[PDB]
């Protein structure tokens, strides 16, 4: 139920504390005071706060603390055992008074109750909250440990225990301190795992943890990454029971769990041919593909802001330029999930609750945020925000936060990471054009100015955060010919499923491209022309004709009649 | 997705023998939350039954318990007053690490 830390220090079971000299002095300073004598350590999970509480006790034996503190002894509250050790009621109260009686008899002694937040908020829990401040009266000292989230809820509302207590801020230890601190626990793992850790191996762990596992604090995460590495040598090598492991395995575990340096052949061709692979699928956008791929390459190389996402792009252009198509195809080539979002639905200020979750306790609170949950499930993703201009300006505030720090908190308070997400947005600010050309015998290219609309709709600070604003030009006549070929291939795949093979002459393709080529409309009419001329006759034959069983179709054009001729053989 | 197949499947791989030697001999189990609640009418029955199973795991030192739907034990049987949930009883043992238990739950 209780342990004597002084005896434990003599035995040597507790690990010697390393560093945290500044934190210890501040704690002892408030502890010595007649009032505000109950120090409280506020720290996130695994930062080191609990170690500091036990480290102070070990220091007493060393004698580096003031001579008056030598009288003090630390006791740990076994909250778990106390709760179980009860039959009807009152068990906690009787035993706690006897312990506190020793503390009251010897005012020097301290009572370190771990996880003080648990005490405040079944039957024994009600009594335990009141027992602390009333019986102590502010004279008997008590140490506590509660996180920032728990400290606000548990201590701010009551304010009686908070006034008696005095917080002591905590910060993440330095990289140098981390290697020193992990050395204390390193001998334990090597013995059980029967592995040997090189000095370079532990050096890699701290750097890898912050870059890939920044969500979880570096000090505790450092302990966890080296633990998995030891297990790897025990189980991963089936033969030779290989000890004497180095950084290579360390990268193998930290990178794998986080899910990398030393680019492999597969990864190399994924980014090397990313631009050429996207040019085949989408034509006439070489300037746009190169810019998008270059930014992604910068992130892999690492020449970019750490907290910001890999890349932020805004595709503004006329209809049918395949702005969204390049986004969908990018996901396919990269093998990264495409989180496609439509901002037309999010055109109201109230709809923001769907993005970051509803307020706590609401009927729809269980659903949660649609953006935070999705990104958490798929950390590496392509966040396509189509028609951003349509959405209410409130979402832009949220997007500004992601661009600046790549983080977003929902009502629950979960922290998301957008460092690996290639944010991409699309807008139609300049689709509107001057249909009226020059009023003269000959036409003139009086097209509306480019990028002028984007500036008015979007604020300047928002534009600055974006890595680049890629304008998509109107497809050329030559480009339309290439577009017809891909659509023809898609038609062939559909026909192949039904057992029909289609052969289209090169002359026929040129005729269809010319008939359906409209610069303003874009490439979408080409599908419509193909559907009207090719899909419609084939569908009638496929249902009520020879093609039902399956056949070979050859399409040609008659020069005299300037119309396509369809030949069905079956 | 296959999380349940991964846990139950581990048992199949162990009997086949295509697993590491360390995990070659592990008596995997499948805790049933509903089964425990069946005979918890009398006070203290849940603690007695739950403590008995936990004791078996630690003494063996190799038994592993696969408890699917770990969210259920968060609010397990607590008639009144004691509020001795399954999570509370198992919380200290997991911290020590003597007993290892696999879990499977949905993102929500």
């Amino acid at each position: 139920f209780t342990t004597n830390l002084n005896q434990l220090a003599r035995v040597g079971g507790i690990d010697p504390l390393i560093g945290r000299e500044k934190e210890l002095e501040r704690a002892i300073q408030v502890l010595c005071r007649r009032r505000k004598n109950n120090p409280l350590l506020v720290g996130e999970s695994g930062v080191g706060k609990t170690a500091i509480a036990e480290g102070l006790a070990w220091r007493i034996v060393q004698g580096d603390v003031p001579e008056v503190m030598a009288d003090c002894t630390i006791y740990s509250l076994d909250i778990g055992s106390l709760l179980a050790g009860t039959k009807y009621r009152g068990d906690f109260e009787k035993r706690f008074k006897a312990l506190l009686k020793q503390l009251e008899q010897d005012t020097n002694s301290i009572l370190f109750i771990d996880e003080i937040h648990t005490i405040i908020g079944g039957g024994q829990v009600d009594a335990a909250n009141l027992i602390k401040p009333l019986l102590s009266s502010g004279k008997i000292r008590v140490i506590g440990s509660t996180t920032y989230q728990e400290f606000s809820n548990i201590f701010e509302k009551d304010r009686a225990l908070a006034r008696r207590f005095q917080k002591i801020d905590i910060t993440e230890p330095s990289i140098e301190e981390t290697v020193q601190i992990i050395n204390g626990l390193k001998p334990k793992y090597e013995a059980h795992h029967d592995v040997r850790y090189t000095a370079k191996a532990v050096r890699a762990a701290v750097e890898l943890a912050v870059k890939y596992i920044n969500d979880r604090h570096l000090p505790d995460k450092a302990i966890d990454v080296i633990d998995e590495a030891g297990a790897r040598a025990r189980l991963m090598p089936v033969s030779k029971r290989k000890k004497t492991v180095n950084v290579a395995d360390i990268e193998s575990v930290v990178a794998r769990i986080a899910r990398e340096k030393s680019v492999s052949q597969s990864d190399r061709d994924t980014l090397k041919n990313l631009g050429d692979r996207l040019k085949m699928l989408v034509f006439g956008q070489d300037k746009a593909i190169e810019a998008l791929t270059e930014a992604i390459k910068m992130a892999r190389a690492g020449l970019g802001h750490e907290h910001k996402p890999v890349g932020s792009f805004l595709f503004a252009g006329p209809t049918g330029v395949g702005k969204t198509e390049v986004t969908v195809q990018l996901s396919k080539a990269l093998g990264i999930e495409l989180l496609r979002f439509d901002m037309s639905e999010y055109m109201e200020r109230h709809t923001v609750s769907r993005l970051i979750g509803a307020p706590p306790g609401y009927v729809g609170f269980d659903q949660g945020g649609l953006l935070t949950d999705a990104v958490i499930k798929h950390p590496h993703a392509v966040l396509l925000l189509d028609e951003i201009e349509k959405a209410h300006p409130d979402v832009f505030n949220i997007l500004l936060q992601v661009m600046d720090n790549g983080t977003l908190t929902d009502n629950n308070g979960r922290k998301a990471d957008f460092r690996n997400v290639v944010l991409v947005m699309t807008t139609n600010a300049g689709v509107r054009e001057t249909e009226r050309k020059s009023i003269g015998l000959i036409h003139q290219d009086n097209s509306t100015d480019a990028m002028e609309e984007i500036k008015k709709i979007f604020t300047p600070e928002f534009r600055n955060r974006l890595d680049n604003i890629i304008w998509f030009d109107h497809l050329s006549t030559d480009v339309i010919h290439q577009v017809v070929d891909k659509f023809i291939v898609e038609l062939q795949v559909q026909l192949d499923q039904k057992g029909v093979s289609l052969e289209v002459s090169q002359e026929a393709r040129n005729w269809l491209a010319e008939k359906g080529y409209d610069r303003a409309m874009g490439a979408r009419p080409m599908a419509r022309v193909i559907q009207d001329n090719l899909k419609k006759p084939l569908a009638n034959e496929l249902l009520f004709g020879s093609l039902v069983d399956g056949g070979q179709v050859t399409v040609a054009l008659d020069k005299e009649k300037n119309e396509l001729t369809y030949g069905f053989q079956s | 997705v296959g999380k349940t197949a991964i846990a139950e499947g581990l048992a199949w791989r162990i009997v086949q023998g295509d697993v590491p030697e360390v995990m070659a001999d592990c008596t995997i189990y499948s805790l049933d939350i509903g089964s425990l609640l069946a005979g918890t009418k009398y006070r203290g029955d849940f603690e007695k039954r739950f403590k008995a199973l936990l004791k078996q795991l630690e003494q063996d030192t190799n038994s592993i318990l696969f408890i699917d739907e770990i969210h259920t034990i968060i609010g397990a049987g607590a008639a009144s007053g004691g509020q001795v949930d399954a999570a509370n009883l198992i919380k200290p043992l997991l911290s020590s690490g003597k007993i290892r238990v696999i879990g499977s739950t949905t993102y929500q």
Partner: peptide, 25 residues
């Protein structure tokens, strides 16, 4: 004229609690 502003009506979830008995012996 002037723009028309609409106001939403927040709805908070409310629930009740049942009880389970246990004979001492």
């Amino acid at each position: 004229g002037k723009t028309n502003d609409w106001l939403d009506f927040d709805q908070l979830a409310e629930e009740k609690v049942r009880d389970a008995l246990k004979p001492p012996s």
